[PDB]
């Protein structure tokens, strides 16, 4: 079976930090880009951060300078270090890998989701 498995969420005061981690099935992530998305109630799922196999990172404008995505290619694991958290960051966070080849999120594999709540 194909599995992505996340952890690290929680409840934290504004200005704090969290670290999300995600472990991927032995073959769906190698040579491929791994990413993080988030979804607040009543909103569509939206991009947060991604890191290519070669190590290039890119971020949503709203988290640039605050979040850092990294990855251990050998362990098939991706991480999201979340600093300077804001109430607007509250959402369910999902790690993701494209099961297709078009960056079309209808084709993505998703983790189960991990709740992040930032109290003001």
């Amino acid at each position: 079976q194909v599995q992505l498995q996340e952890s690290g969420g929680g409840l934290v005061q504004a200005g704090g930090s969290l670290r999300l981690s995600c472990a991927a099935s032995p073959g769906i992530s190698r040579y491929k880009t791994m990413g993080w998305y988030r979804q607040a109630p009543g909103k569509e799922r939206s991009f947060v951060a991604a890191i290519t196999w070669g190590g290039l990172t890119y971020y949503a404008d709203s988290v640039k300078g605050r979040f850092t995505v990294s990855r251990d290619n050998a362990k098939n694991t991706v991480y999201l270090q979340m600093n300077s958290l804001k109430p607007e960051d509250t959402a369910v966070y999902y790690c993701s890998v494209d099961g297709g080849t078009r960056a079309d999120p209808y084709h993505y594999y998703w983790g189960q989701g991990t709740q992040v709540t930032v109290s003001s």
Side-chain angles (χ1 to χ4, degrees), residues 22-36:
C22 169
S25 294
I28 63 175
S29 66
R30 316 249 307 150
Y31 307 104
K32 302 183 64 123
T33 297
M34 302 182 76
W36 292 97

Side-chain angles (χ1 to χ4, degrees), residues 31-85:
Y31 307 104
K32 302 183 64 123
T33 297
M34 302 182 76
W36 292 97
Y37 285 69
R38 65 185 171 181
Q39 187 169 15
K43 288 150 90 134
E44 74 175 11
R45 186 161 311 177
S46 56
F47 181 75
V48 176
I51 182 165
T52 69
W53 175 255
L56 180 68
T57 62
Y58 48 89
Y59 298 89
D61 298 341
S62 292
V63 311
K64 208 184 180 356
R66 299 191 297 116
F67 292 6
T68 303
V69 64
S70 66
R71 169 193 195 166
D72 186 317
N73 286 355
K75 288 198 91 223
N76 301 315
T77 58
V78 69
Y79 304 92
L80 188 66
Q81 177 68 30
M82 298 170 83
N83 296 316
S84 300
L85 280 159

